[PDB]
Design a protein around this ligand. Structure first.
Ligand SMILES: O=c1ccn([C@@H]2O[C@H](COP(=O)(O)OP(=O)(O)O[C@H]3O[C@H](CO)[C@@H](O)[C@H](O)[C@H]3O)[C@@H](O)[C@H]2O)c(=O)[nH]1
Ligand SMILES: O=c1ccn([C@@H]2O[C@H](COP(=O)(O)OP(=O)(O)O[C@H]3O[C@H](CO)[C@@H](O)[C@H](O)[C@H]3O)[C@@H](O)[C@H]2O)c(=O)[nH]1
Lengths: 432, 432
């Protein structure tokens, strides 16, 4: 119902406007806060000011137009000005893999220094909140230090507040999160973020900054582990002539086991799970730990796309000169994102084996071309792609794929499409 | 409410009266079936006829007395007579590890031959149901063959119907299972078991016998995997000075992740998880598969008790001649079962390092003596044990342990007891 009197409107900035940053910036404005965003790329800022998302995310264009109409969302000309105009800054810049697989923290360090400069100009207390996925210790270590080194002696507080948004449903996960984790460096940080999130109906857990940072890796690596476990069990089910999805239907009814994320197939792609899992392994190894399960998780994941190509190659009797399609290039359905896409990886493996490769995706073909260029043929109609190839690998289960005519084709199914069983030869990547 | 007319009373036999067999025998009788049980050990049968459970299981003595009073439960003088007097036989004998870690199937094979002899004497169709944890393929392979080889040509059907009972809550899991899995070798098998379970309100999934067998290993190994994952994450949390249980409180709120079985500590013992995990690995390796995650699961598990002893040894500056206690010998709370107990394993490691070892358990000390003999001192009062030792390892979180006085002691906590933090030195085995 009604808003209680004296219910404070917070002034928040967000640095880094990938899907995490732009969904928080828009969402906080729609929750009732004044938000100032900034990104290193001026064309992102220009597009966002115009109400035109630079990335595809269901419902974002309308949430953005609503946040802009409220007058509560704006964008700054520099990181420092966004910071100086607000009381807390969410750092949401990327943490891509470094060359040795550890987390690359240079983007977070530059954003923290910008925060320190804005604080110095503001002259009063500010909260620095790390939304970026960063190894435990980064918030009170690197970020607090980089901020202090620029802040000219102005006092501030830090907090880790990890994010759990999934691409494809980020706005819903923003408004209805399963839980909010606040790793506050002090009481004033904790009370400020509990205020920021007061309108969100979800459990709020306040803990140390290190614990909150570890929650994020433990969560993402455990999801990756369910997927790789389903694939390990699936290789076995496939040898037994059994349906791995029916097995995990029964496994998931146990009240101790989550029924989701046992979707065996080509494995996980996207810009999070592969690189967070690798960062987690490298971080543990830097402390002398073996990380044996987490490494196994990645070994299975890296194997699956090679196995899918080996199945196709065995069924066709070699791939050189053969006409082969890949259905699906986005890293999952309903995005145009190809980062770490298993479909792209499968196309490359096919190419490296002398196949003539055709690809389709309902959304990601422009992004995939950015990566594959003219090395493949891009087909606009997925049926037309099937009609042209001898063999096909299904790499993303777009709903339109369920209705295609696979009859007479050799199909290596990497995502479980029930209709594909009608094929002349059906090979499940991790099931019979 | 009322029982519909013509609601058939099934005649069922059970071979093998460990906790699975005796809980099914009693439970089926209480559901309304006529049950005939048998076990290779005549003293078990004699005790059960007298209403005296040979094993400790909460509520069993009363369920048994009720099943016996109904007149519906009896016990045979031989496996063959139990079989010949019924229409379906649940095989529930053990499947311990063989010398090379694979499943030992000799107990199941002998029970299946007995079933075949009873069928031959009966002269008409019978259902053979495998409740034993057996590798996929065993029901329609070894068991169907061993039955046919003795049945003299009498027709029969087979089914895998795995069991998911936990020790300590087996009667409740019997009456209120999360799901019933029926891997029927034909339609008549499926319809017979759906009848047997008609009064149990739970989802019933009918599938191939191989799929049902694989569900059981996938479920038990996945639970073991959660535990080992919590321990892998816990070694890391401990290096960070963080509380792993608070981390997995937050991880478990994700709607994709089951909140249970992330109890980091000394790892899993008991007669199921260690040997089923090892059987699963050996079964996959027999088909040429690497089983990398499942092996990692066991590597972490085998490490934890060694690590706990290493922590104690480091804190005390060597263990030779030192007086050290183990609190907890049962493999989990509320049983007297010590099979594969981590407490026993820790006592042995301590012994092998020249410690003078004291042990306590509220129930399992007689069973543990069967294993450790006079190599340790058995202490009746756990406080008295603490008062006598310099260092202690907590290996089973019996509720009475939460109230003890650990002040001034060196404690390596293997199970998360909050009160133990009052110790002079507190080392969590997998947390700070
Ligand atoms: O059962 C499954 C589920 C997913 N996937 C694959 O796993 C990858 C990741 O999928 P998803 O979790 O939807 O994508 P993200 O948007 O990368 O979301 C993850 O990464 C975000 C960034 O850290 C976290 O906030 C989210 O909680 C976590 O889901 C995709 O390639 C999926 O196709 C499977 O192979 N099998
Ligand atoms: O978070 C946890 C939970 C359990 N344990 C340990 O794991 C072992 C197994 O515990 P539990 O699952 O209670 O014992 P079981 O009676 O061995 O039950 C398992 O094995 C039965 C036999 O197959 C299956 O039916 C059950 O579903 C499965 O729980 C014990 O040593 C526990 O102390 C942990 O270390 N951490």
């Amino acid at each position: 119902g009604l808003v209680p009197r004296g219910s404070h409107m917070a002034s928040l900035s967000v640095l880094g406007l990938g899907y995490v940053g732009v969904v928080h910036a828009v969402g906080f404005a729609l929750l009732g806060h004044r938000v100032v965003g900034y990104d290193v790329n001026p064309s992102i800022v220009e597009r966002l000011r115009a109400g035109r998302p630079h990335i595809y995310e269901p419902g974002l264009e309308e949430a953005l137009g609503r946040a802009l109409s409220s007058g509560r969302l704006s964008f700054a000309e520099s990181a420092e000005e966004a910071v100086a105009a607000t009381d807390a800054t969410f750092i949401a810049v990327g943490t891509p893999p470094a060359p040795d697989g550890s987390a690359d923290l240079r983007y977070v360090e530059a954003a923290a220094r910008a925060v320190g400069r804005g604080i110095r100009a503001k002259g009063r207390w500010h909260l620095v909140v790390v939304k970026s996925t960063v190894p435990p210790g980064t918030t009170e270590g690197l970020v607090a230090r980089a901020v202090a080194e620029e802040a000219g002696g102005v006092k501030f507080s830090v907090a880790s507040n990890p994010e759990f948004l999934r691409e494809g449903s980020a706005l819903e996960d923003f408004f209805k999160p399963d839980r909010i984790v606040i790793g506050a460096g002090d009481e004033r940080a904790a009370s400020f973020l509990l205020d920021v999130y007061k309108a969100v109906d979800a459990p709020k857990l306040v803990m140390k900054p290190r614990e909150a940072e570890l929650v994020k890796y433990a969560s993402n690596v455990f999801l990756a582990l369910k997927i790789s476990f389903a694939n390990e069990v699936g290789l076995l089910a496939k040898r037994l002539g059994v349906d791995t999805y029916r097995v995990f239907e029964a496994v998931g009814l146990d009240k101790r086991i989550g029924r989701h994320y046992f979707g065996a197939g080509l494995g996980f792609g996207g810009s999070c799970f592969p690189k967070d899992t690798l960062a987690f392994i490298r971080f543990g190894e830097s402390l002398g730990l073996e990380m044996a399960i987490s490494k196994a998780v990645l070994r299975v994941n890296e194997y699956m796309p090679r196995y899918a190509v080996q199945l196709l190659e065995e069924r066709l009797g070699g791939l050189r000169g053969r006409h082969v399609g890949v259905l699906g290039l986005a890293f999952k359905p309903n995005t145009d994102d190809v980062r770490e896409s298993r479909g792209v990886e499968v196309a490359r493996l096919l190419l490296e084996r002398g196949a003539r490769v055709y690809v389709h995706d309902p959304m990601a073909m422009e992004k995939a071309r950015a990566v594959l260029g003219d090395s493949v043929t891009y087909v606009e109609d997925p049926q037309a792609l099937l009609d042209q190839v001898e063999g096909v690998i299904i790499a993303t289960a777009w709903p339109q794929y369920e209705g295609l005519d696979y009859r007479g084709k050799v199909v290596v199914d990497g995502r479980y499409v029930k209709k594909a069983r009608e094929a002349k030869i059906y090979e499940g990547v991790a099931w019979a």
